């Protein structure tokens, strides 16, 4: 997250870290057994880390639970990032508590102009590199589809939305992928892609979770 703020330990209790020996992507806990992340975060060997604030210090509220199954969307296209969504099943159910909690899935799609909360342990620099240990947060508005398409001509599908600031300076970034975009208390987006981070005229692009609620619900009813 570039241009964000330190969230505060466990204030984003649905945020998970995906770990393969190291943090590599975010995700969102949707119930005690399942995480939603980006399909481009797929790896074998994933451990889900819940209750994290500093990902490099064991502070006392973590739950570390191996994935048993990952399910990339059936129509995921890694070239365009269309349908950039994955489900991860935990080997055992998390213990839900004040610091480890699920986020609701949406009923309706979020509205242009709505401010959402984006979070993660990704790079905090637009130019260069610096990875924070503690979770960072950013409030950012959903942009109109017309503005989004104009920023990325020939690249935006109806399964994507842009959010952020066209003047630059505030965005998600590498290492935030797969994490939550929460708007009116529901999971509306997944950190997916963008040209650079926090550059002018290049806002973040997010998987549009409201398009996937029927696939999520039938898949979790079935696995
Ligand atoms: Ca920790």
XYZ file of C-alpha atoms and ligand atoms in Angstrom:
224
model
C 0.000 0.000 0.000
C 1.527 3.332 -1.153
C 0.320 6.478 0.592
C -1.603 4.629 3.272
C -1.569 4.445 7.060
C -0.829 1.855 9.719
C -4.176 0.148 10.290
C -3.751 -0.725 13.957
C -3.291 -4.285 15.143
C -6.179 -6.608 14.309
C -8.532 -3.754 13.182
C -8.973 -5.566 9.841
C -9.715 -9.016 11.340
C -10.720 -10.632 7.975
C -7.302 -9.816 6.408
C -5.095 -12.872 5.970
C -1.519 -13.309 4.807
C -0.711 -16.153 2.416
C 2.649 -17.634 3.249
C 4.906 -20.022 1.274
C 7.978 -19.523 3.444
C 7.393 -15.795 3.204
C 4.377 -13.510 2.808
C 3.427 -13.298 -0.840
C -0.269 -12.199 -1.134
C -3.280 -11.173 0.907
C -6.720 -12.761 1.187
C -10.013 -12.332 2.986
C -11.602 -14.751 5.410
C -15.260 -15.308 4.329
C -16.134 -17.994 6.930
C -14.267 -20.195 9.375
C -13.143 -22.626 6.513
C -12.577 -20.421 3.410
C -10.463 -17.553 2.133
C -11.054 -15.513 -1.013
C -7.899 -14.307 -2.866
C -6.710 -13.539 -6.401
C -6.175 -16.453 -8.862
C -2.821 -14.844 -9.817
C -1.759 -15.554 -6.161
C -2.142 -19.313 -6.797
C 0.849 -21.363 -5.454
C 1.000 -24.915 -4.090
C 2.138 -25.091 -0.428
C 0.160 -22.196 0.971
C -0.187 -21.595 4.732
C -2.914 -19.103 5.702
C -1.943 -16.767 8.487
C -4.851 -15.191 10.369
C -4.761 -12.672 13.260
C -1.586 -11.037 11.865
C -0.336 -7.556 12.449
C 3.526 -7.726 12.206
C 4.093 -10.615 9.789
C 7.703 -10.985 11.066
C 6.989 -11.223 14.786
C 4.786 -13.766 16.556
C 2.690 -11.385 18.716
C 0.199 -13.806 20.251
C -3.074 -13.576 18.298
C -2.105 -15.539 15.109
C -3.620 -18.713 13.778
C -1.470 -20.541 11.183
C -3.513 -23.071 9.204
C -2.433 -24.947 6.046
C -4.569 -24.818 2.942
C -6.116 -28.177 2.005
C -7.494 -27.117 -1.390
C -7.237 -24.167 -3.692
C -9.823 -23.528 -6.478
C -8.920 -20.965 -9.167
C -12.020 -19.632 -10.972
C -12.940 -21.830 -13.936
C -12.675 -18.918 -16.401
C -9.522 -17.289 -14.985
C -7.385 -15.890 -17.774
C -3.845 -15.132 -16.487
C -3.065 -12.979 -19.562
C -5.853 -10.444 -19.033
C -6.490 -11.167 -15.372
C -10.171 -11.585 -16.218
C -11.865 -13.550 -13.367
C -8.878 -13.012 -11.017
C -10.386 -14.839 -8.050
C -9.553 -18.032 -6.141
C -10.957 -19.872 -3.118
C -8.684 -21.464 -0.521
C -10.095 -24.088 1.918
C -8.337 -24.370 5.323
C -7.371 -27.780 6.616
C -9.215 -27.010 9.889
C -11.639 -24.258 10.759
C -10.297 -21.015 12.248
C -11.375 -20.062 15.681
C -13.347 -16.877 15.147
C -12.816 -14.168 17.761
C -12.353 -10.427 18.019
C -9.111 -10.497 16.028
C -10.031 -13.236 13.514
C -13.367 -12.645 11.820
C -15.120 -13.198 8.540
C -16.194 -10.507 6.069
C -19.661 -10.585 4.476
C -20.092 -11.197 0.742
C -22.094 -8.569 -1.134
C -25.696 -8.694 -2.251
C -25.385 -5.810 -4.627
C -22.529 -4.461 -6.515
C -20.904 -1.326 -5.024
C -21.580 2.141 -6.419
C -18.995 4.536 -8.278
C -17.804 7.055 -5.796
C -18.078 4.745 -2.727
C -15.048 4.909 -0.400
C -13.598 1.507 0.370
C -10.905 0.166 2.702
C -7.958 -1.622 0.966
C -5.292 -3.297 3.072
C -2.112 -5.314 2.871
C 1.567 -5.895 3.527
C 2.687 -4.859 0.025
C 5.228 -2.313 -1.160
C 4.827 1.175 0.202
C 6.872 2.947 -2.487
C 5.680 4.108 -6.015
C 9.408 4.344 -7.010
C 11.524 1.737 -5.471
C 10.965 -0.785 -2.713
C 10.053 -0.946 0.933
C 7.955 -3.666 2.530
C 6.298 -2.953 5.809
C 6.030 -5.509 8.550
C 2.733 -4.197 9.957
C -0.538 -4.107 8.049
C -1.212 -0.948 6.034
C -4.598 0.509 5.062
C -5.895 2.959 2.452
C -9.305 4.488 1.921
C -9.964 4.866 -1.787
C -13.054 5.590 -3.923
C -14.411 3.425 -6.719
C -13.972 5.225 -10.035
C -16.552 5.359 -12.829
C -16.349 2.555 -15.482
C -15.759 5.226 -18.094
C -12.785 6.671 -16.222
C -11.431 3.140 -15.606
C -11.666 2.215 -19.292
C -10.118 5.436 -20.348
C -7.104 4.749 -17.991
C -6.630 1.200 -19.403
C -8.044 1.169 -22.960
C -8.849 -2.349 -24.330
C -8.114 -3.946 -20.896
C -11.081 -3.505 -18.509
C -13.808 -6.185 -18.445
C -17.155 -6.123 -16.622
C -15.392 -8.330 -13.957
C -13.085 -5.432 -12.949
C -13.380 -1.994 -11.407
C -10.864 0.780 -10.735
C -10.424 2.502 -7.376
C -7.955 5.157 -6.223
C -6.723 8.571 -7.235
C -5.851 9.625 -10.756
C -3.412 12.329 -9.502
C -1.181 9.479 -8.077
C 0.327 8.947 -4.666
C -2.178 6.506 -3.130
C -2.729 2.897 -4.295
C -2.284 -0.790 -3.586
C 0.886 -2.440 -4.855
C 2.952 -5.577 -5.265
C 2.405 -7.860 -2.250
C -1.117 -6.506 -1.608
C -2.527 -8.785 -4.400
C -5.370 -10.988 -3.335
C -6.324 -8.798 -0.381
C -9.613 -7.083 0.388
C -11.385 -4.063 -0.909
C -14.241 -3.547 1.619
C -17.052 -1.103 0.848
C -20.119 -0.654 3.142
C -18.908 -3.556 5.245
C -18.846 -6.084 2.377
C -16.075 -7.635 0.276
C -16.504 -5.852 -3.050
C -13.026 -6.176 -4.559
C -9.746 -8.168 -4.653
C -6.422 -6.433 -5.238
C -5.659 -7.570 -8.821
C -3.476 -5.318 -11.002
C -2.449 -1.846 -12.164
C 0.372 -0.214 -14.144
C 3.034 0.403 -11.502
C 1.723 1.673 -8.148
C 0.347 5.106 -7.345
C 1.318 6.545 -10.764
C -0.710 9.351 -12.329
C -3.655 8.214 -14.486
C -3.018 4.524 -13.583
C -5.414 3.633 -10.723
C -5.657 0.216 -9.137
C -7.776 -2.449 -10.826
C -9.778 -4.868 -8.651
C -11.706 -8.057 -9.240
C -15.482 -7.283 -8.980
C -16.505 -9.767 -6.242
C -20.257 -9.159 -6.672
C -20.085 -11.048 -9.993
C -18.807 -14.161 -8.225
C -21.117 -14.625 -5.217
C -23.102 -17.512 -6.874
C -19.903 -19.336 -7.838
C -18.486 -18.804 -4.337
C -21.648 -20.032 -2.657
C -22.034 -23.163 -4.852
C -18.401 -24.008 -4.576
C -18.325 -23.792 -0.750
C -21.570 -25.868 -0.639
C -19.847 -28.517 -2.542
C -16.220 -28.745 -1.175
Ca 2.720 -11.854 13.618
